[PDB]
RNA sequence: GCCCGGAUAGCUCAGUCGGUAGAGCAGGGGAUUGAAAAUCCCCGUGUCCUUGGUUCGAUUCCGAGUCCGGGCACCA
RNA sequence: UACGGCCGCAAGGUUAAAACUCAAAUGAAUUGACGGGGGCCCGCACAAGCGGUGGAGCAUGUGGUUUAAUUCGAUGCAACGCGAAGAACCUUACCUGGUCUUGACAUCCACGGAAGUUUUCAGAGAUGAGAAUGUGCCUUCGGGAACCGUGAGACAGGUGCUGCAUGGCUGUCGUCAGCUCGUGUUGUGAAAUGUUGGGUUAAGUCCCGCAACGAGCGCAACCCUUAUCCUUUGUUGCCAGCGGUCCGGCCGGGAACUCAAAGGAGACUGCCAGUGAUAAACUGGAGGAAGGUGGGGAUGACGUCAAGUCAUCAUGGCCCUUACGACCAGGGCUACACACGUGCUACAAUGGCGCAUACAAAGAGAAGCGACCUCGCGAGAGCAAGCGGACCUCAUAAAGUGCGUCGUAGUCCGGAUUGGAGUCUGCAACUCGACUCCAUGAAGUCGGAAUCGCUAGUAAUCGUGGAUCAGAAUGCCACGGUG
């Protein structure tokens, strides 16, 4: 409610050691079976070699670029009815949010297996594909697209 | 996911899709849900670990899949190895219950050999 | 209900057990049992004895039993009367050589039990609750002590609508474990209903 | 498992078992009322049950105390 | 008595070149409510007025009947 | 207002009753409740997210419907995995039938008869009709005491009715910060003040102020428990050193260490700085193992809901008594032709499956927990040690990690159902039990409207134990892993 502290410092990736990738595995994690999450994403994250052939590291961030929004809505119980006054999105959630769309939509892909069903999505991310990239504009069509209230 | 192993019956009513298992029937797959609380109108998906897996508990009571068939194929042979009429007919693909093998018995004997 | 026992809540600190002894699941079952029979009986033949508490030590097949009373002499007997009787009554009741040491109660106006059994007895004597409850209990404040909360249940006086009463002096912070208080109950089955009473005597702090 | 106070049994078989024990033992006594309960005294006796077509042998055992006689007699045919 | 129309769900009604028919309401089961409503979700057990015929098959098409409805029964 | 008069073009105005009816109608001010009034606040209340319920199969309860019975109760948050921490008989209170009427359970009396054990028949059994076996003692030889028979009655018996007759006990606003009193003062008085105001805190906590000065129930603190270290003792616990190894702390040995568990130190805004009126307090900081009531328990003010319970118990009154008392048998509380709430297991590759294998806590146990070993595919059985417990046993954790596989289909998913046949409890498991094996293998491909919990070792998930208990746990209580 009124509580005001700090964020929960997360433990970096099991290898590259990166908070950005840390909360990534967590957002992807399920049933506290964190192990699988690693062995499911940490693989597809490197399986990019077969998909490219080099130091697959920045590919992740570059892939998220096509999935990084900067405007969202927010209904407000004002003016009798309910406003929508859209507002941008700070970095703290930009990177986070995206990760959800990248995973929460990579599951309904319906491919070989979550391990790979995820990999492909990354390539589709930077190359614009799947609901992951969709959600962006499908969301932007509200904010910045309806500044009439913003 | 497969309960008794292999075959994931998904997107169908419980009991109705429960019979999917190579061992239970319209009645059996039903009698289990009762003591399991799990209704029939609920699709396997709608369930949860403490719903779908629970089914995998009271299922280890009956015999199913592979070995169930083998245990039978062998049991059959047990009485079939004996020079009894049943066996003598069982090893020839002829009705051992009480049909007129003299005619009309396609599914029994097999294809037509004109 | 919405109050913790002002005694048991402190049974750990500042409050000793009125029956300290060891025992294992085996006899423990019948052990606390006999203790009840003996303790329940020690009151039957010593009601007017003005007995307060009744501890029960137990070393090995020889319970002690200490009958604290404001009136020791009467609990003594004709130079052996009472004592002998009780000390012998504890025969098969415990099937062991049970002794009995009496303890004199200093200032019978600060001890809960008494101040409770008394007011209730006065009620049974056809007396106005308010009078005794207040004055006949107010004494606990004159012989010392700092705070005493009394409480009389319902059905007091001609009335079908049971009602509880207050009346308290000094301070009775029963919300303090390091407070130590003398709490005890007492009934009074009269012509109608069972007007109860609860004595809360705050005997100093820590 | 449905009588609480008063384990009922079909009198038909009642008078018989009590009669059999009277003179000791003998051959089974025809019985159609399965809904009864395997009585204790019937221990090691002979009873029958009209399962629709005919009757079935019944030899009470120590355990057989408050179980339904019918239980020991099938009904429909199968396999 | 005469001519014209109606008869379809519990009510009021819509409907069909001939093969398995609906709406508003009421009714029912969920919901939400402290409880009722109002509102939200899911629900039609209709021998299509009777009796003859055409037909493979009739609520539908043909004849008649009851009932209702509108009109009429006038010179005398 | 009616009627009459007067006035009016007409609306209608003016003047102005009675019948009958009620015990009040009314005025201001006070306390509080409420307001789709205002100001200021706190709570997972919302917002921010994590996972759910709503769909699905099964468990459980409830309303229905049914039933001879489906025993009684619980019904907005406070009813529904609730009284039930455990309904096959029993339980039980419900139904059916058979049966008993000082009676199953208590005393008093009369006269008899040891209590006791084996017993035969009639019966479903309740029971009744018979054969023995049986004579203990107070012995003042009247009488007797425990107990049994049967006769009479006062009665015994009631889970029957009132929880708006009650005690006792419980939930709830709410761990909310509130609730009051003495005196003094203020108004004719109800009543106020205090207790409001300014800051502040988790708080009627604190600091100023102030016609109030103090006090009580509260809040805080005492209690437990968890977080560091110290003293002490060293078995079943420990093994740092040294030594001997039938390599296992197995054996000397050793009180160091983990641990055990009795007692101690430590946390207080104590100290530093800044804000604040050079106050309370706040904001950071040092030191520490641990900050700003350390984390969690426990603790529930005045009272509200005529809230719940006469069904645990107790009890006023009312009821019934050759019977709403009591015994047996079987049946019922597990019925369905739907609905609503609380759960478990899924719908799958953050996965299943095979093999391999590492880590924890808190606990139970003489009609008990049960080893090793032997049999069986397996549940389990036979034989039989150990422990009545840091010695033994239930107990040799799951997630996990290694490899390999299967490759997004209703599957290698998920298990409901049913059939076949079997075990263990117990007279006895048809009705109506737990589990094992074989076969069967459904719905379900993440769930509208709407809705719940959760602020940190939390939610999330993964196992472990225990109460009840002969034997029916996905419920309840509890423990630790990962997070």
Whose CA is nearest the C1' atom of nucleotide F215?
C170
- Integer distance in angstroms from CA C155 to C1' F166? 9
- For C35, the 3-state DSSP assignment is helix
CA gyration radius, chain A: 17
Q: Which of residues 17-56 of A touch strand F (CB under 7 A)?
A: 25, 27-41, 43
- Integer distance in angstroms from CA C74 to C1' E52? 118
Residues 6+ apart with CB under 8 A from A22: A10, A11, A12, A13
Q: SS3 string of chain C?
A: CCCCCCCHHHCCCCCCCCCCECCCHHHHHHHHHHHHHHHHHHHHCCCCCCEEEEECCECCCCCCCEEEECCHHHHHCCCCHHHHHHHHHCCCCCCCCCCCEEEECCCCCCCHHHHHHHHHHHHCCCCCHHHHHHHHHHHHHCCCCCCEECCECCCCCCCCCCCCCCCEECCCCCCCHHHCCEEEEECCECCCCECCEEEEECCCCC
* The pair of three-digit structure tokens given for residue D23, joined into one six-digit string: 């003179």
- Integer distance in angstroms from CA A3 to C1' F42? 12
- Integer distance in angstroms from CA A81 to C1' E22? 39
**Overall resolution, Å:** 3.9
Neighbours of chain A (3+ CB pairs under 8 A): none
C180/C172 Cα distance (integer angstroms) = 9
Classify residue C202 by its DSSP letter: -
C193/B17 Cα distance (integer angstroms) = 66
**For chain B, counts of helices (H) and of strands (E):** 6, 0
Q: Closest by alpha carbon to B3, among B23, B31, B26? A: B23
Q: Which of residues 25-64 of D touch strand F (CB under 7 A)?
A: 35-41, 43, 61-64
- Note whether C206 and C163 are within 8 A (CB): no
Q: Which bases of chain F come closer than 7 Å to a protein CB?
A: 42-48, 50-60, 69, 81, 88-97, 121-125, 165-174, 215-224, 298-303, 314, 316, 328-334, 343-353, 365-366, 389, 399-402, 407-421, 425-432, 434-447, 455-456, 459-462, 472, 474-475, 481-483
Domains of chain C (ranges, CATH numbers): 16-106 (3.30.300.20), 107-206 (3.30.1140.32)
Backbone angles phi, psi at A18, to 5 degrees: -150, 115
| Alpha carbon C8 to its chain's center | 14
Classify residue D71 by its DSSP letter: G
C6 touches strand F (CB under 7 A): no
Helix H or strand E encompassing A115: helix A114-126
Residue where the block lists tokens 């004709």: C78
C182/C191 Cα distance (integer angstroms) = 29
C41/C89 Cα distance (integer angstroms) = 9
Q: Closest by alpha carbon to A119, among A48, A25, A29? A: A48
Give D17: exposed, middle or buried? Use CB within 10 Å, 0-12, 13-18, 19+.
Answer: buried
Experimental technique used to determine this entry? cryo-EM
C160 touches strand F (CB under 7 A): yes
A63 touches strand F (CB under 7 A): no
A119/A134 Cα distance (integer angstroms) = 17
Residue where the block lists tokens 């192993």: B5
Neighbours of chain C (3+ CB pairs under 8 A): none
- Integer distance in angstroms from CA A7 to C1' F458? 15
- Note whether C145 and C179 are within 8 A (CB): no
B113 touches strand F (CB under 7 A): no
Please state, as a whole number, how many other Cβ atoms lie within 10 Å of the Cβ of residue D30: 12
Helix H or strand E encompassing C110: none
- Integer distance in angstroms from CA B42 to C1' E26? 33
C168 touches strand F (CB under 7 A): yes
- Note whether C123 and C188 are within 8 A (CB): yes
How far CA B72 is from CA of A90, B68, B80, C4, in Å, comes to: 67, 6, 11, 68
- Note whether D56 and D38 are within 8 A (CB): no
């Amino acid at each position: 409610r009124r509580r005001v502290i700090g964020q929960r410092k997360i433990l970096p990736d099991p290898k590259f050691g990166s908070e950005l990738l840390a909360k990534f595995v967590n957002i992807l994690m399920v049933d506290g079976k964190k192990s699988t999450a690693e062995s499911i994403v940490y693989s597809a994250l490197e399986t990019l070699a077969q998909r490219s052939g080099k130091s697959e590291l920045e590919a992740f961030e570059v892939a998220l670029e096509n999935v990084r929004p900067t405007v969202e809505v927010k209904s407000r119980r004002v003016g009798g009815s309910t406003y929508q006054v859209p507002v941008e999105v700070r970095p703290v959630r930009r990177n986070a949010l995206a990760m959800r769309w990248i995973v929460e939509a990579a599951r309904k892909r319906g491919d070989k297996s979550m391990a790979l069903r995820l990999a492909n999505e990354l390539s589709d991310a930077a190359e614009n594909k799947g609901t992951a990239v969709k959600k962006r504009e499908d969301v932007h069509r509200m904010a910045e697209a309806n500044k009439a209230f913003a | 996911a497969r309960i008794a192993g292999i075959n994931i019956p998904d997107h169908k009513h419980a009991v109705i899709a429960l019979t999917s298992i190579y061992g239970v029937g319209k009645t059996r797959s039903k009698a289990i849900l009762a003591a399991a609380g799990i209704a029939e109108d609920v699709k396997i998906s709608e369930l949860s670990e403490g719903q779908i897996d629970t089914l995998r508990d009271e299922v280890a009571k009956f015999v199913v899949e592979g070995d169930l068939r083998r245990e039978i194929s062998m049991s059959i042979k047990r009485l079939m190895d004996l020079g009894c009429y049943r066996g003598l007919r069982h090893r020839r693909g002829l009705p051992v219950r009480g049909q007129r093998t003299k005619t009309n018995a396609r599914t029994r004997k097999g294809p037509r050999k004109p | 209900g919405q109050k913790v026992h002002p005694n048991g809540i402190r049974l750990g600190i500042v409050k000793p057990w009125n029956s300290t002894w060891f025992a294992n699941t085996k006899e423990f079952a019948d052990n606390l049992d006999s203790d009840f029979k003996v303790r329940q009986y020690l009151t039957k033949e010593l009601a007017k004895a003005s007995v307060s508490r009744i501890v029960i030590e137990r070393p090995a097949k020889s319970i002690r039993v200490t009958i604290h009373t404001a009136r020791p002499g009467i609990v003594i007997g004709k130079k052996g009367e009472d004592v002998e009787k009780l000390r012998k009554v504890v025969a098969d009741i415990a099937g062991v050589p049970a002794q009995i040491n009496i303890a004199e109660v200093r200032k019978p106006e600060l001890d809960a039990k008494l101040v409770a059994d008394s007011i209730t007895s006065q009620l049974e004597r056809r007396v106005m609750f308010r009078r005794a409850m207040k004055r006949a209990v107010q004494n606990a404040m004159r012989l010392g002590a700092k705070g005493i909360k009394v409480e009389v249940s319902g059905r007091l006086g001609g009335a079908e609508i049971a009602r509880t009463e207050w009346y308290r002096e000094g301070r009775v912070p029963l919300h303090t474990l390091r407070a130590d208080i003398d709490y005890n109950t007492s009934e009074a089955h009269t012509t109608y209903g069972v007007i109860g009473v609860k004595v809360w005597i705050f005997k100093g702090e820590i | 498992r449905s009588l609480k106070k008063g384990p009922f049994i079909d009198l038909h078989l009642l008078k018989k078992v009590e009669k059999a024990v009277e003179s000791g033992d003998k051959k089974p006594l025809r019985t159609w009322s399965r809904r009864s309960t395997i009585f204790p005294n019937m221990i090691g006796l002979t009873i029958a049950v009209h399962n629709g077509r005919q009757h079935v042998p019944v030899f009470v055992t120590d355990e057989m105390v408050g179980h339904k006689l019918g239980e020991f007699a099938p009904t429909r045919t199968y396999r």
